[PDB]
Design a protein around this ligand. Structure first.
Ligand SMILES: COC(=O)c1ccc(C(=O)OCCO)cc1
Length: 261
C-alpha cells in the first residue's frame, strides 16, 4: 500500500489526544470561494497525504470544528477548517464552499511558497462537517463520488435521501439532539445509503454539539474519525477493525454499520 503512513495503530494510539506526527498550521490568505480557512498539516508524515475539508453548522465558525484539525493532521492528513461566506449559508452552498476549499488545498500543494507544497496527494480527499455542514458534506459526496471518505456529525439537510452517496460514510449522531433530531435527520440519512460502506455512531446523551470542539468523548470520536479516514482515504486495512467494529461502549447509544471491511 503506497498510501500507508505512520506506525501500526492501537486503541491507545487512536484514543490519544495526538497522533504520531507533528502538526503546524496557517491561515489561508485569499480564500477561494469561502469565508476563511485554517490549514493543519503534518511536518513529518514521510510521504504525501490525503486532504480533508471541514465545515461548521448554521451560525457557527471554525472554533466549533477546529479540534479535528490537529487530531486528524497528527495521524497524516492535511486538514482545512473553514468559515463560510455567511454564517447563515445553507447545506448546498456549504458543499460548494467545502469543495472550493479542497480545490484551494490542491492549489497550495502546487504553490512553492506554501507550507504544504508537495505534501498532498490531491487524488485522495475527504469531507467532514457539523449539522448543515454535515449535510453539505453528504451533498459533496453525492456530487463527487471520487471522494474517498465522508464523516459528518449531527448532519442535517432538508432532504434525507442520500441513496446517491457511494463514498464510505461515517455518521456521528448525538442522541438528545434537539436541533437536528436523530429520528428525522441523521438516522434516515444513514438508512438511505445503499451502495457504500457506512456507519452510524450515536453518542449517549449527546446534545447537538456532541462531536464539537470541547466535547467529552474525544477519545472515542477521534479514534473513529481517524480510523475511518485512514481505512478509506489511505486504503489502509491496518485500520479495518477500528473502522468497522462496534466499540461496545457505554458512551454509544446506537451503533450500526454495513458493507464495512
Ligand atoms: C429542522 O432543522 C433545523 O432547524 C436546523 C437548524 C440548524 C442547523 C445547524 O446547522 O445547526 C448547527 C448549529 O451550528 C440544522 C438544522
Amino acid at each position: 500500500n503506497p498510501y500507508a503512513r505512520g506506525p501500526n495503530p492501537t486503541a491507545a494510539s487512536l484514543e490519544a489526544s495526538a497522533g504520531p506526527f507533528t502538526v503546524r498550521s496557517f491561515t489561508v490568505s485569499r480564500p477561494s470561494g469561502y469565508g476563511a480557512g485554517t490549514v493543519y498539516y503534518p511536518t513529518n508524515a514521510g510521504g504525501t497525504v490525503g486532504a480533508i475539508a471541514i465545515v461548521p453548522g448554521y451560525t457557527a465558525r471554525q472554533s466549533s470544528i477546529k479540534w479535528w484539525g490537529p487530531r486528524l493532521a497528527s495521524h497524516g492528513f492535511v486538514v482545512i477548517t473553514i468559515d463560510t461566506n455567511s454564517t447563515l449559508d445553507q447545506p448546498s452552498s456549504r458543499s460548494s464552499q467545502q469543495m472550493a476549499a479542497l480545490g484551494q488545498v490542491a492549489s497550495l500543494n502546487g504553490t512553492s511558497s506554501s507550507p504544504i507544497y508537495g505534501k498532498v496527494d490531491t487524488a485522495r480527499m475527504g469531507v467532514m462537517g457539523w449539522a448543515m455542514g454535515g449535510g453539505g458534506s453528504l451533498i459533496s459526496a453525492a456530487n463527487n463520488p471520487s471522494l474517498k471518505a465522508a464523516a459528518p456529525q449531527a448532519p442535517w439537510d432538508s432532504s434525507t435521501n442520500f441513496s446517491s452517496v457511494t463514498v464510505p460514510t461515517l455518521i456521528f449522531a448525538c442522541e438528545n439532539d434537539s436541533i437536528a433530531p436523530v429520528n428525522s435527520s441523521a438516522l434516515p440519512i444513514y438508512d438511505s445509503m445503499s451502495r457504500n460502506a457506512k456507519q452510524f455512531l450515536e453518542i449517549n446523551g449527546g446534545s447537538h454539539s456532541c462531536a464539537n470542539s470541547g466535547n467529552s468523548n474525544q477519545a472515542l470520536i477521534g479514534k473513529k474519525g481517524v480510523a475511518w479516514m485512514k481505512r478509506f482515504m489511505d486504503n489502509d486495512t491496518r485500520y479495518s477493525t477500528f473502522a468497522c467494529e462496534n466499540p461496545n461502549s457505554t458512551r454509544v447509544s446506537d451503533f450500526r454499520t454495513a458493507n464495512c471491511s
